[PDB]
Paper text:
Mammalian lactate dehydrogenase D (LDHD) catalyzes the oxidation of D-lactate to pyruvate. We demonstrate that mLDHD is an Mn2+-dependent general dehydrogenase which exhibits catalytic activity for D-lactate and other D-2-hydroxyacids containing hydrophobic moieties, but no activity for their L-isomers or D-2-hydroxyacids containing hydrophilic moieties. Similar to other members of the VAO/PCMH flavoprotein family, mLDHD consists of an FAD-binding domain, a substrate-binding domain and a C-terminal domain. The substrate-binding site contains a positively charged pocket to bind the common glycolate moiety and a hydrophobic pocket with some elasticity to bind the varied hydrophobic moieties of substrates.
Crystallization experiments show that soaking of the mLDHDFAD crystals in crystallization solution supplemented with the substrates and MnCl2 often yields the product-bound or mixed substrate/product-bound structures. Thus, we prepared the loss-of-function H405A mutant mLDHD (mLDHDH405A), and determined the crystal structures of the mLDHDH405A mutant in FAD-bound form and in complexes with FAD and various substrates (D-lactate, D-2-hydroxybutyrate, D-2-hydroxyvalerate, D-2-hydroxyhexanoic acid, D-2-hydroxyoctanoate, D-2-hydroxyisovalerate, D-2-hydroxyisocaproate, and D-2-hydroxy-3-methylvalerate) at high resolutions (1.31–1.75 Å). In the substrate-bound mLDHD and mLDHDH405A structures, all the substrates are clearly defined in the electron density maps; however, Mn2+ is only identified at the active site in the WT structure, but not in the mutant structures due to the mutation of the metal-coordinating His405. Although the DL-isomer mixtures of some substrates (DL-2-hydroxyvalerate, DL-2-hydroxyhexanoate, DL-2-hydroxyoctanoate, DL-2-hydroxyisocaproate, and DL-2-hydroxy-3-methylvalerate) were used in the crystallization experiments, only the D-isomers bind to the active site, further confirming that mLDHD has high stereo-selectivity for the D-isomers over the L-isomers. Comparison of the D-lactate-bound and other substrate-bound mLDHDH405A structures also reveals no major conformational changes for the residues at the substrate-binding subsite A, and the other substrates bind to the same site and the C1-carboxyl and C2-hydroxyl groups of substrates maintain similar hydrogen-bonding interactions with the surrounding residues as D-lactate. However, along with the increase of the size of the hydrophobic moiety of substrate, the key residues composing the substrate-binding subsite B undergo conformational changes to varied extents to accommodate the larger hydrophobic moiety. Concurrently, the larger hydrophobic moiety of substrate makes more hydrophobic interactions with the surrounding residues.
Residue numbers in the entry: 27 to 334, 337 to 484
Write the structure that this text describes.
């Protein structure tokens, strides 16, 4: 990468906000996944949207790939610079604006995390519910199409993103639903907001997100429930959803995951396939939800609910850190994660089959999941140097993905495609789906410089 080009970057953002140092590039060449670090040729920190536009235009016109970077907590190598280029770290733009409590909306820049937003919001009576375990950039969450434990009740990023400010690959500034707009519904033209949610940095750079806020619940009850078998826990989940209980959180941990979380958090739950549950409402509504939900879990051998401010906080902090609890089981290890999502009635079959398949192989694995959405993750520990093990783990992940596709589901409920699921995506949407996605990619990124090598 030429020093004339580097000087042009520094002319936009300032010398301290451009780095070509190997260590700095290496830190920005990977996410939290196993995917091998592929360092960008430079890291740039734009300080405002004008600078984002001018960095993009400079890179695009010079044929230099652009890799948007939020908090680097992604799962599929989205920030790996497989063709080199310029990594754009967006987190110095960290302001919350346009807080409209009366309209339940707010605008956030890429450096705002969920914890920052919800801290800004306490005593407002509002909160933002979409809660991935890592305290990620909210714009990165929009880019990946994230969900979380609260999504079963309060929706995914796709449900809660009302507008996006996007710097297109050649530097033009798009407000997907119109500058400054925020509303509950619209039929005006084609919905551009939904196209950029889940685009993973391959269609443009999200420089702000307009988010739906929600009223804080009147009252909250959290509990855990231990089951004799994976079958029993997942059958309970399906029956709770079919009974239309509006549970706020319903999370599955298999016995391996529950033990891992016990050892990583000093929870001390019975080591067993377990549901973490949370219920929102008034005292009247809570008692009714609890009664209907306990009746279903009782039918399937669930324990009496172990009840959990600090104790629910400890409970969900342990759940949010399940990934690290799993890694802590074999220290030094990395891991791959699957993310299939199936029609809920097929969830017992596939998740029990996954448990059986884990057992029948030399691989080790833990299961945790947003099962209220029909979604779960298999966490598969890999020795970074054992290439024999890595290709069994890859083979296992591909086979699980294909089983989910055979059941009418999707290969990823929330994490995305990145580098790891591109073949599964081709199978999932077929030739006309792939060509159509590629045609959209091409009109927004003709030169193919917007995070190349990802998704398609
Ligand atoms: C412990 C743990 C728990 C997690 N739990 C969940 C969970 O429950 N649900 C879930 O969905 N995910 C979960 N994640 C994954 C991850 O936190 C989410 O995918 C998150 O949305 C990634 O945001 P990020 O800014 O850290 O992404 P990064 O890794 O920085 O980037 C992810 C992708 O988005 C692109 N990108 C990032 N910012 C922008 C932007 N502003 N504009 C355009 N493209 C951009 C990147 O180019 C890349 O392709 C978890 C991760 C960890 C480590
Ligand atoms: C590389 C990070 C992968 C984290 C997988 C588990 C996450 O989805 C959750 O549900 O806690």
């Amino acid at each position: 990468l030429s020093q004339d080009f580097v000087e042009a970057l520094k002319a936009v953002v300032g010398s301290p906000h451009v780095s070509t140092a190997s260590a700095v590039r290496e830190q920005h060449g990977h996410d939290e996944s196993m995917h091998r670090c592929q360092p960008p040729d430079a890291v740039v920190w734009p300080q405002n949207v004008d600078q984002v536009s001018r960095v993009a235009s400079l890179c695009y016109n010079q044929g230099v790939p652009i890799i948007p970077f939020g908090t680097g907590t992604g799962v599929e190598g989205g920030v790996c610079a497989v063709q080199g280029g310029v990594c754009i770290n967006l987190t110095h733009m960290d302001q919350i604006t346009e807080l409209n409590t009366e309209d339940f909306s707010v605008v956030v820049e890429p450096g705002v995390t969920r914890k920052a937003l919800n801290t800004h919001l306490r005593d407002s009576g509002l909160w933002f519910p979409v809660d991935p375990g890592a305290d990620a950039s909210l714009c990165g969450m929009a880019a990946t199409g994230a969900s979380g434990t609260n999504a079963v009740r309060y929706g995914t990023m796709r449900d809660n993103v009302i507008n996006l400010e996007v710097v297109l690959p050649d530097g033009r500034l798009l407000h997907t639903a119109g500058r400054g707009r925020h509303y509950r519904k619209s039929a005006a033209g084609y919905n551009l907001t939904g196209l950029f949610v889940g685009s993973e940095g391959t269609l443009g750079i999200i420089t702000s997100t307009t988010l739906r806020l929600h009223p804080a619940p009147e009252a909250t009850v959290a509990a855990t429930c231990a089951f004799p078998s994976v079958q029993a826990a997942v059958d309970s989940t399906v029956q709770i959803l079919q009974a239309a209980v509006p549970v706020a959180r319903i999370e599955f941990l298999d016995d391996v995951m529950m033990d891992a979380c016990n050892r990583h958090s000093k929870l001390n739950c019975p080591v067993a396939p377990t549901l973490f549950l949370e219920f929102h409402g008034s005292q009247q509504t809570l008692a009714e939800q609890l009664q209907r939900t306990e009746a279903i879990t009782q039918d399937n051998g669930g324990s009496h609910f172990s009840w959990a401010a600090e104790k629910r906080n400890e409970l969900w902090a342990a759940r949010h850190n399940a990934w690290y609890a799993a890694l802590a089981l074999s220290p030094g290890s990395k891991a791959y994660s699957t993310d299939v999502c199936v029609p809920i009635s097929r969830l017992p079959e596939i998740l029990v089959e996954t448990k059986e398949e884990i057992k029948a192989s030399k691989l080790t694995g833990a299961i945790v999941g947003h099962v209220g959405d029909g979604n779960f993750a298999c966490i598969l520990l890999v020795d970074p140097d054992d290439a024999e093990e890595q290709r069994r783990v890859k083979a296992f992940a591909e086979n699980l993905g294909r089983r989910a596709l055979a059941l009418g589901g999707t290969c990823t409920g929330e994490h995305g495609i990145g580098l790891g699921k591109r073949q599964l995506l081709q199978e999932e949407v077929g030739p006309v789906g792939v060509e159509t996605m590629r045609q959209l990619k091409n009109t927004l990124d003709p030169r193919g410089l917007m995070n190349p090598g990802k998704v398609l």
